[PDB]
Amino acid sequence: WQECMDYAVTLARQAGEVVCEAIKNEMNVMLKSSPVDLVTATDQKVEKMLISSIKEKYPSHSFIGEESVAAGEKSILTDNPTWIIDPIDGTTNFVHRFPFVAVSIGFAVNKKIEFGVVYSCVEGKMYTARKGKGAFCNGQKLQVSQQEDITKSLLVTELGSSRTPETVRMVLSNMEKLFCIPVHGIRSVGTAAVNMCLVATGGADAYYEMGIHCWDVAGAGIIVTEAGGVLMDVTGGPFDLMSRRVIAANNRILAERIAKEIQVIPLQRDDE
């Protein structure tokens, strides 16, 4: 695994260089499933780069990538060394030049995540973690916050990709329950990976969301657990990479409390 990991880091860093030049040029903005689900030619270009480079040195391995699944590929995770890639987490941010866009590379062996690389381009911050070895941002070790009281916590979440009134009302209703506990506040920078990395640095205490996909959270989940945090399903049960739901918190006390307060939204899983 370490050989794979340091290749992943040189790859994440050059894919990030591509994204950072592209953000300052004109862009072709295209639509995937709706007027608000967006893709650009840079997304597709970076995933092609990443998957071809990895196949070259590791032909035996599997790949789950956002744009590949958009081009009809499948997201079923098997025990084979799988690379789970999102070339640009933050495409809406990227299109707008809102300054938070990340490349996320997650690696799973036996359906368990072994390492994660998340590179935030505009900030120039590389976050990395390998199981048992700690979580880092540009060499500095990270640790989650120590907060255990929900009325003193700062949470991060997103409003989601749907615009169906009933799903939207459920998202907002869940934000209302949390907000009125009361919590100190809720933030949204626009990318699931960066939201989870801010939890790993201790800047936020918890992140929760329903509607994400495995490629958005694969790389950052292990940066959270290796910074001392916790991953959990919104049922309060164990985290399932393919279920489209995640609570990533500094500790089990806040995660359980968030799960107790929010209601599950119906969604198709990534392996269905």
Sites of contact with a second copy (CB under 8 A):
35-36, 38, 92-93, 95-99, 145, 151, 154, 158-159, 163, 165, 168-169, 172, 175-176, 179-180, 182-190, 198, 201-205
Amino acid identity of residue 95, one-letter, is V
Q: How far apart (Å, rounded) are the C-alpha atoms in residues 264 and 235?
A: 7
How many other CB atoms are there within 10 angstroms of residue 195's CB atom?
Answer: 29
Structure tokens at 267: 């969604």
- Establish if 270 lies at the interface with Ca ion (CB under 5 A): no
Between 46 and 75, how does the x/- string for binding to Ca ion read (CB under 5 A)? --------------------x---------
* CA angle in degrees (0–180, nearest 5) for 221-225-226: 110
Query: Residues 6 or more apart from 112 whose CB is under 8 A from it?
Result: none
- Establish if 158 lies at the interface with Ca ion (CB under 5 A): no
Structure tokens at 171: 């998202």
Sign for the CA dihedral angle at 194, 195, 196, 200 comes to positive
- Is 130 or 213 the residue whose CB approaches Ca ion more closely? 213
Q: Any known ligand binding at 191?
A: yes
86 interacts with, out of Ca ion, a second copy, none, CB within 5 to 8 A per kind: Ca ion
- Is 203 or 237 the residue whose CB approaches a second copy more closely? 203
- Is 18 or 95 the residue whose CB approaches a second copy more closely? 95
Least distance between Ca ion and beta carbon 89 (Å): 5
6 is catalytic: no
Sign for the CA dihedral angle at 11, 29, 212, 269 comes to negative
Closest residue to Ca ion, judged by C-beta, is 86
- Is 18 or 159 the residue whose CB approaches a second copy more closely? 159
Cis peptide before 59 (omega within 30 of 0): no
- Is 198 or 234 the residue whose CB approaches a second copy more closely? 198
Which residue is it, tokens 């809720």?
186
Among the listed residues 43, 47, 66, 205, the single catalytic one is 66
Among the listed residues 91, 128, 157, 225, the single catalytic one is 91
Q: Are strands 62-65 and 82-89 parallel, antiparallel or unpaired?
A: parallel
| Local structure of residue 251 (DSSP, 8 states) | S
88 is catalytic: yes
164 is catalytic: no
| Binding residue (CB under 5 A) for Ca ion from 47, 86, 158, 209 | 86
92 interacts with, out of Ca ion, a second copy, none, CB within 5 to 8 A per kind: a second copy
Query: Residues 6 or more apart from 47 whose CB is under 8 A from it?
Result: 65, 66, 67, 68, 85, 87
By CB under 5 A, name the binding residues for Ca ion. 66, 86, 88
Catalytic residues: 66, 86, 88-89, 91, 216
Binding-site entries for Mg(2+) = 66, 86, 88-89, 216
